[PDB]
Protein backbone atom coordinates (compact mmCIF):
# COMPACT_ATOMS: atom_id res chain seq x y z
CA UNK A 1 0.00 0.00 0.00
CA UNK A 2 2.93 2.37 0.45
CA UNK A 3 4.56 1.88 -2.92
CA UNK A 4 1.42 1.99 -5.02
CA UNK A 5 -0.97 4.73 -6.03
CA UNK A 6 -4.39 4.73 -4.40
CA UNK A 7 -6.21 6.43 -7.29
CA UNK A 8 -5.17 4.47 -10.37
CA UNK A 9 -4.02 1.43 -8.32
CA UNK A 10 -0.72 0.92 -10.11
CA UNK A 11 2.70 0.29 -8.65
CA UNK A 12 4.64 3.56 -8.65
CA UNK A 13 7.86 1.85 -9.68
CA UNK A 14 9.47 2.55 -13.02
CA UNK A 15 8.03 -0.01 -15.40
CA UNK A 16 11.41 -1.43 -16.42
CA UNK A 17 12.00 -2.52 -12.81
CA UNK A 18 8.73 -4.47 -12.81
CA UNK A 19 9.22 -6.11 -16.21
CA UNK A 20 12.88 -6.97 -15.57
CA UNK A 21 12.16 -8.49 -12.18
CA UNK A 22 9.17 -10.37 -13.62
CA UNK A 23 11.31 -11.89 -16.37
CA UNK A 24 14.13 -12.68 -13.93
CA UNK A 25 11.72 -14.50 -11.63
CA UNK A 26 10.21 -16.42 -14.56
CA UNK A 27 13.71 -17.50 -15.55
CA UNK A 28 14.60 -18.47 -11.98
CA UNK A 29 11.57 -20.77 -11.76
CA UNK A 30 13.29 -23.17 -14.19
CA UNK A 31 16.64 -22.78 -12.46
CA UNK A 32 18.38 -20.93 -15.29
CA UNK A 33 20.73 -19.01 -13.05
CA UNK A 34 22.69 -17.79 -16.09
CA UNK A 35 20.05 -15.55 -17.61
CA UNK A 36 19.29 -13.17 -14.74
CA UNK A 37 22.19 -10.98 -15.85
CA UNK A 38 21.49 -11.55 -19.53
CA UNK A 39 18.01 -10.08 -19.08
CA UNK A 40 19.54 -7.08 -17.33
CA UNK A 41 22.00 -6.64 -20.20
CA UNK A 42 19.11 -6.76 -22.69
CA UNK A 43 17.05 -4.22 -20.76
CA UNK A 44 19.93 -1.76 -20.32
CA UNK A 45 20.58 -1.50 -24.04
CA UNK A 46 16.82 -1.46 -24.72
CA UNK A 47 16.47 1.53 -22.39
CA UNK A 48 19.56 3.10 -23.93
CA UNK A 49 17.68 2.86 -27.24
CA UNK A 50 14.28 4.29 -26.23
CA UNK A 51 11.98 4.51 -23.20
CA UNK A 52 9.36 1.84 -22.71
CA UNK A 53 5.56 2.01 -22.85
CA UNK A 54 3.70 0.80 -19.79
CA UNK A 55 0.69 -0.48 -21.73
CA UNK A 56 2.71 -3.18 -23.51
CA UNK A 57 3.70 -5.83 -20.98
CA UNK A 58 6.26 -7.36 -23.30
CA UNK A 59 9.39 -5.47 -24.29
CA UNK A 60 9.82 -7.52 -27.52
CA UNK A 61 13.29 -8.68 -26.39
CA UNK A 62 12.74 -9.62 -22.75
CA UNK A 63 9.65 -11.76 -23.20
CA UNK A 64 11.16 -13.35 -26.31
CA UNK A 65 14.44 -14.26 -24.60
CA UNK A 66 12.55 -15.32 -21.47
CA UNK A 67 10.27 -17.58 -23.50
CA UNK A 68 13.33 -19.07 -25.24
CA UNK A 69 14.97 -19.78 -21.88
CA UNK A 70 11.85 -21.23 -20.20
CA UNK A 71 10.92 -23.38 -23.21
CA UNK A 72 14.55 -24.46 -23.52
CA UNK A 73 14.77 -25.50 -19.86
CA UNK A 74 11.78 -27.67 -19.02
CA UNK A 75 13.25 -30.24 -16.63
CA UNK A 76 15.05 -27.46 -14.76
CA UNK A 77 12.15 -26.91 -12.38
CA UNK A 78 13.30 -29.69 -10.06
CA UNK A 79 16.89 -28.44 -10.33
CA UNK A 80 16.07 -24.96 -9.06
CA UNK A 81 16.63 -25.82 -5.41
CA UNK A 82 20.38 -25.26 -5.13
CA UNK A 83 22.10 -22.56 -3.06
CA UNK A 84 22.86 -20.37 -6.07
CA UNK A 85 19.28 -20.25 -7.36
CA UNK A 86 17.87 -19.69 -3.87
CA UNK A 87 20.45 -17.00 -3.10
CA UNK A 88 19.78 -15.12 -6.33
CA UNK A 89 15.99 -15.34 -5.94
CA UNK A 90 16.22 -14.19 -2.32
CA UNK A 91 18.51 -11.32 -3.30
CA UNK A 92 16.22 -10.15 -6.11
CA UNK A 93 13.02 -10.28 -4.02
CA UNK A 94 14.72 -8.56 -1.08
CA UNK A 95 16.27 -5.86 -3.25
CA UNK A 96 12.84 -5.16 -4.73
CA UNK A 97 11.15 -4.83 -1.35
CA UNK A 98 13.96 -2.66 0.00
CA UNK B 99 26.89 -49.54 -17.78
CA UNK B 100 30.25 -50.02 -16.11
CA UNK B 101 30.08 -49.57 -12.35
CA UNK B 102 32.56 -46.86 -11.49
CA UNK B 103 32.48 -46.75 -7.71
CA UNK B 104 34.63 -48.45 -5.08
CA UNK B 105 34.99 -52.25 -5.23
CA UNK B 106 35.28 -52.26 -1.44
CA UNK B 107 32.33 -52.31 0.89
CA UNK B 108 32.49 -49.19 3.01
CA UNK B 109 32.11 -49.26 6.77
CA UNK B 110 28.65 -47.73 6.55
CA UNK B 111 27.48 -50.43 4.18
CA UNK B 112 28.42 -53.42 6.29
CA UNK B 113 26.59 -51.90 9.25
CA UNK B 114 23.36 -51.65 7.30
CA UNK B 115 23.89 -55.01 5.58
CA UNK B 116 24.38 -56.68 8.96
CA UNK B 117 21.44 -54.71 10.37
CA UNK B 118 19.07 -55.69 7.60
CA UNK B 119 20.24 -59.29 7.58
CA UNK B 120 20.07 -59.61 11.37
CA UNK B 121 16.57 -58.17 11.23
CA UNK B 122 15.75 -60.83 8.67
CA UNK B 123 17.17 -63.59 10.89
CA UNK B 124 15.20 -61.98 13.73
CA UNK B 125 12.20 -63.08 11.71
CA UNK B 126 12.29 -66.70 10.69
CA UNK B 127 14.42 -66.21 7.59
CA UNK B 128 16.42 -69.32 6.67
CA UNK B 129 20.04 -69.25 7.73
CA UNK B 130 22.49 -69.94 4.92
CA UNK B 131 25.30 -70.94 7.29
CA UNK B 132 25.69 -73.48 10.07
CA UNK B 133 24.70 -72.16 13.50
CA UNK B 134 27.43 -73.10 15.95
CA UNK B 135 25.18 -72.39 18.92
CA UNK B 136 24.75 -68.66 18.32
CA UNK B 137 21.61 -66.96 19.62
CA UNK B 138 22.49 -63.45 18.53
CA UNK B 139 21.35 -62.50 15.01
CA UNK B 140 24.33 -60.15 14.62
CA UNK B 141 26.79 -63.00 15.05
CA UNK B 142 24.90 -65.09 12.51
CA UNK B 143 24.85 -62.15 10.11
CA UNK B 144 28.60 -61.74 10.57
CA UNK B 145 29.14 -65.41 9.74
CA UNK B 146 26.99 -64.98 6.63
CA UNK B 147 28.95 -61.88 5.63
CA UNK B 148 32.25 -63.71 6.13
CA UNK B 149 31.06 -66.73 4.13
CA UNK B 150 29.84 -64.47 1.25
CA UNK B 151 26.35 -65.93 1.61
CA UNK B 152 24.21 -62.78 1.85
CA UNK B 153 22.13 -62.06 -1.28
CA UNK B 154 21.22 -58.40 -0.63
CA UNK B 155 21.89 -55.74 -3.29
CA UNK B 156 23.38 -52.38 -2.26
CA UNK B 157 21.95 -49.64 -4.46
CA UNK B 158 24.54 -46.88 -4.27
CA UNK B 159 22.74 -43.64 -5.06
CA UNK B 160 24.78 -40.96 -6.73
CA UNK B 161 23.85 -37.35 -5.90
CA UNK B 162 22.11 -36.63 -9.20
CA UNK B 163 19.59 -39.39 -8.49
CA UNK B 164 21.37 -42.07 -10.46
CA UNK B 165 22.43 -45.33 -8.86
CA UNK B 166 24.30 -48.54 -9.47
CA UNK B 167 23.69 -51.97 -7.99
CA UNK B 168 26.19 -54.12 -6.11
CA UNK B 169 25.65 -57.41 -4.42
CA UNK B 170 27.61 -58.03 -1.27
CA UNK B 171 29.13 -61.01 -3.07
CA UNK B 172 30.88 -58.65 -5.50
CA UNK B 173 32.22 -56.26 -2.87
CA UNK B 174 35.55 -56.69 -1.14
CA UNK B 175 35.05 -57.01 2.59
CA UNK B 176 37.88 -56.33 5.03
CA UNK B 177 38.27 -56.34 8.80
CA UNK C 178 56.97 14.18 -12.94
CA UNK C 179 59.89 12.29 -14.47
CA UNK C 180 61.67 9.16 -13.12
CA UNK C 181 58.45 8.24 -11.27
CA UNK C 182 55.88 8.41 -14.05
CA UNK C 183 58.31 6.49 -16.26
CA UNK C 184 58.48 3.84 -13.55
CA UNK C 185 54.69 3.71 -13.32
CA UNK C 186 54.30 3.51 -17.10
CA UNK C 187 56.98 0.81 -17.28
CA UNK C 188 55.25 -1.27 -14.61
CA UNK C 189 51.76 -0.89 -16.07
CA UNK C 190 53.11 -1.75 -19.49
CA UNK C 191 54.89 -4.86 -18.22
CA UNK C 192 51.78 -5.91 -16.34
CA UNK C 193 49.47 -5.56 -19.31
CA UNK C 194 52.00 -7.44 -21.43
CA UNK C 195 51.89 -10.27 -18.90
CA UNK C 196 48.10 -9.97 -18.93
CA UNK C 197 47.90 -10.19 -22.71
CA UNK C 198 50.21 -13.20 -22.74
CA UNK C 199 48.15 -14.92 -20.06
CA UNK C 200 44.99 -14.32 -22.05
CA UNK C 201 46.77 -15.92 -24.99
CA UNK C 202 47.99 -13.09 -27.21
CA UNK C 203 51.27 -12.97 -29.12
CA UNK C 204 53.88 -11.27 -26.91
CA UNK C 205 57.61 -11.81 -27.38
CA UNK C 206 60.08 -12.62 -24.62
CA UNK C 207 61.92 -9.32 -25.04
CA UNK C 208 58.61 -7.50 -24.69
CA UNK C 209 58.00 -9.31 -21.41
CA UNK C 210 61.54 -8.83 -20.08
CA UNK C 211 61.68 -5.14 -20.96
CA UNK C 212 63.87 -3.40 -18.41
CA UNK C 213 63.42 0.24 -17.47
CA UNK C 214 66.46 1.29 -19.50
CA UNK C 215 65.05 -0.56 -22.51
CA UNK C 216 61.79 1.26 -21.84
CA UNK C 217 63.64 4.58 -21.91
CA UNK C 218 65.27 3.44 -25.16
CA UNK C 219 62.08 2.31 -26.93
CA UNK C 220 59.77 5.05 -25.66
CA UNK C 221 61.01 8.39 -24.43
CA UNK C 222 61.72 9.61 -20.96
CA UNK C 223 60.23 12.89 -19.56
CA UNK C 224 56.48 12.17 -19.88
CA UNK C 225 55.78 15.64 -18.51
CA UNK C 226 57.61 16.97 -21.55
CA UNK C 227 55.63 14.41 -23.52
CA UNK C 228 58.14 12.18 -25.25
CA UNK C 229 56.05 9.24 -24.01
CA UNK C 230 52.48 10.27 -24.60
CA UNK C 231 49.77 7.97 -23.33
CA UNK C 232 48.45 8.05 -26.89
CA UNK C 233 51.85 6.75 -28.00
CA UNK C 234 51.73 3.71 -25.67
CA UNK C 235 48.56 2.15 -27.13
CA UNK C 236 49.40 -1.45 -28.04
CA UNK C 237 47.61 -3.93 -30.28
CA UNK C 238 48.15 -7.57 -29.42
CA UNK C 239 46.68 -10.36 -31.54
CA UNK C 240 45.47 -13.81 -30.53
CA UNK C 241 47.26 -17.05 -31.29
CA UNK C 242 44.35 -18.98 -32.82
CA UNK C 243 43.79 -16.45 -35.62
CA UNK C 244 44.76 -12.82 -36.27
CA UNK C 245 41.16 -11.78 -36.82
CA UNK C 246 40.51 -11.14 -33.11
CA UNK C 247 43.11 -8.66 -31.92
CA UNK C 248 42.81 -6.44 -28.87
CA UNK C 249 43.68 -2.84 -28.11
CA UNK C 250 45.00 -1.61 -24.79
CA UNK C 251 44.28 2.12 -24.49
CA UNK C 252 45.95 4.46 -22.03
CA UNK C 253 43.68 7.53 -22.05
CA UNK C 254 45.03 11.03 -21.58
CA UNK C 255 42.42 12.53 -19.27
CA UNK C 256 42.52 11.45 -15.60
CA UNK C 257 38.74 11.21 -15.22
CA UNK C 258 37.32 9.35 -18.22
CA UNK C 259 33.83 10.05 -19.54
CA UNK C 260 31.75 8.79 -22.45
CA UNK C 261 33.30 11.36 -24.81
CA UNK C 262 36.61 9.46 -24.79
CA UNK C 263 35.20 5.95 -25.13
CA UNK C 264 33.09 7.01 -28.11
CA UNK C 265 36.35 8.02 -29.80
CA UNK C 266 37.88 4.67 -28.82
CA UNK C 267 34.90 2.78 -30.23
CA UNK C 268 35.20 4.80 -33.44
CA UNK C 269 38.83 3.69 -33.64
CA UNK C 270 37.77 0.09 -33.05
CA UNK C 271 35.03 0.15 -35.70
CA UNK C 272 37.50 1.05 -38.44
CA UNK C 273 39.96 -1.82 -38.02
CA UNK C 274 37.11 -4.21 -37.01
CA UNK C 275 38.36 -4.69 -33.47
CA UNK C 276 35.99 -6.51 -31.15
CA UNK C 277 37.81 -6.06 -27.84
CA UNK C 278 39.73 -3.35 -26.00
CA UNK C 279 41.03 -2.59 -22.52
CA UNK C 280 41.09 0.93 -21.05
CA UNK C 281 43.65 1.68 -18.33
CA UNK C 282 42.45 4.75 -16.45
CA UNK C 283 44.41 6.57 -13.76
CA UNK C 284 41.42 7.66 -11.75
CA UNK C 285 38.22 5.72 -12.12
CA UNK C 286 35.61 6.16 -14.79
CA UNK C 287 32.30 7.89 -14.28
CA UNK C 288 29.49 5.40 -13.53
CA UNK C 289 27.70 6.63 -16.66
CA UNK C 290 30.72 5.65 -18.75
CA UNK C 291 30.91 2.41 -16.74
CA UNK C 292 27.34 1.60 -17.77
CA UNK C 293 28.31 2.68 -21.29
CA UNK C 294 31.15 0.13 -21.45
CA UNK C 295 28.76 -2.53 -20.19
CA UNK C 296 26.11 -1.22 -22.59
CA UNK C 297 28.15 -1.95 -25.72
CA UNK C 298 27.00 -5.06 -27.57
CA UNK C 299 28.90 -8.29 -28.20
CA UNK C 300 30.32 -6.17 -31.06
CA UNK C 301 32.50 -4.24 -28.58
CA UNK C 302 33.86 -5.88 -25.43
CA UNK C 303 35.45 -3.01 -23.51
CA UNK C 304 37.08 -3.55 -20.13
CA UNK C 305 38.57 -1.14 -17.66
CA UNK C 306 41.45 -1.21 -15.19
CA UNK C 307 42.73 1.29 -12.72
CA UNK C 308 46.38 2.13 -13.10
CA UNK C 309 46.97 1.48 -9.40
CA UNK C 310 45.80 -2.14 -9.62
CA UNK C 311 48.29 -2.78 -12.43
CA UNK C 312 51.44 -1.87 -10.51
CA UNK C 313 51.88 -5.55 -9.65
CA UNK C 314 50.63 -8.67 -11.36
CA UNK C 315 48.32 -10.19 -8.77
CA UNK C 316 48.63 -13.68 -10.24
CA UNK C 317 52.28 -13.82 -9.19
CA UNK C 318 51.29 -13.64 -5.51
CA UNK C 319 51.89 -16.78 -3.49
CA UNK C 320 48.26 -17.16 -2.43
CA UNK C 321 46.70 -16.64 -5.86
CA UNK C 322 46.55 -20.07 -7.53
CA UNK C 323 46.69 -20.72 -11.25
CA UNK C 324 43.46 -20.08 -13.13
CA UNK C 325 42.80 -21.75 -16.48
CA UNK C 326 39.74 -20.98 -18.57
CA UNK C 327 38.13 -24.12 -19.93
CA UNK C 328 36.83 -24.74 -23.41
CA UNK C 329 33.23 -25.82 -23.83
CA UNK C 330 34.38 -29.37 -24.59
CA UNK C 331 36.12 -29.58 -21.23
CA UNK C 332 33.12 -28.18 -19.35
CA UNK C 333 30.94 -30.83 -21.00
CA UNK C 334 33.15 -33.70 -19.88
CA UNK C 335 33.45 -32.04 -16.47
CA UNK C 336 29.69 -31.95 -15.98
CA UNK C 337 29.52 -35.48 -17.41
CA UNK C 338 32.11 -37.01 -15.05
CA UNK C 339 30.33 -35.83 -11.92
CA UNK C 340 26.78 -35.88 -13.40
CA UNK C 341 26.48 -32.30 -12.43
CA UNK C 342 24.61 -29.12 -13.26
CA UNK C 343 26.14 -25.68 -13.56
CA UNK C 344 23.80 -24.55 -10.79
CA UNK C 345 25.71 -26.80 -8.40
CA UNK C 346 29.26 -25.80 -9.21
CA UNK C 347 31.02 -23.15 -7.07
CA UNK C 348 31.01 -19.54 -8.11
CA UNK C 349 33.53 -16.83 -8.88
CA UNK C 350 32.27 -13.32 -9.44
CA UNK C 351 32.72 -11.56 -12.73
CA UNK C 352 34.06 -8.55 -10.84
CA UNK C 353 36.61 -10.78 -9.14
CA UNK C 354 40.14 -9.41 -9.70
CA UNK C 355 41.47 -12.58 -11.30
CA UNK C 356 38.35 -13.02 -13.42
CA UNK C 357 38.92 -9.43 -14.54
CA UNK C 358 42.58 -10.26 -15.16
CA UNK C 359 41.88 -13.26 -17.38
CA UNK C 360 38.91 -11.45 -18.92
CA UNK C 361 36.40 -14.21 -18.40
CA UNK C 362 32.81 -14.01 -19.60
CA UNK C 363 29.93 -15.03 -17.39
CA UNK C 364 29.01 -18.66 -17.85
CA UNK C 365 32.55 -19.90 -18.39
CA UNK C 366 34.10 -22.40 -15.99
CA UNK C 367 37.57 -21.71 -14.59
CA UNK C 368 39.91 -24.56 -13.72
CA UNK C 369 41.99 -23.73 -10.65
CA UNK C 370 45.20 -25.52 -9.66
CA UNK C 371 45.63 -24.89 -5.98
CA UNK C 372 49.09 -25.20 -4.49
CA UNK C 373 47.79 -27.43 -1.73
CA UNK C 374 49.74 -28.32 1.39
CA UNK C 375 48.12 -31.69 2.07
CA UNK C 376 48.12 -32.69 -1.58
CA UNK C 377 50.59 -31.36 -4.05
CA UNK C 378 48.23 -29.75 -6.52
CA UNK C 379 44.45 -29.69 -6.29
CA UNK C 380 42.07 -29.13 -9.21
CA UNK C 381 38.89 -27.28 -8.32
CA UNK C 382 36.38 -25.63 -10.64
CA UNK C 383 34.39 -22.41 -10.32
CA UNK C 384 31.82 -20.90 -12.65
CA UNK C 385 31.81 -17.19 -13.45
CA UNK C 386 28.54 -15.59 -12.39
Ligand SMILES: [Zn+2]
Pocket residue numbers: 005006007008009010
Ligand atom coordinates in the same frame (compact mmCIF):
# COMPACT_ATOMS: atom_id res chain seq x y z
ZN1 LIG D 1 -2.19 6.95 -9.87
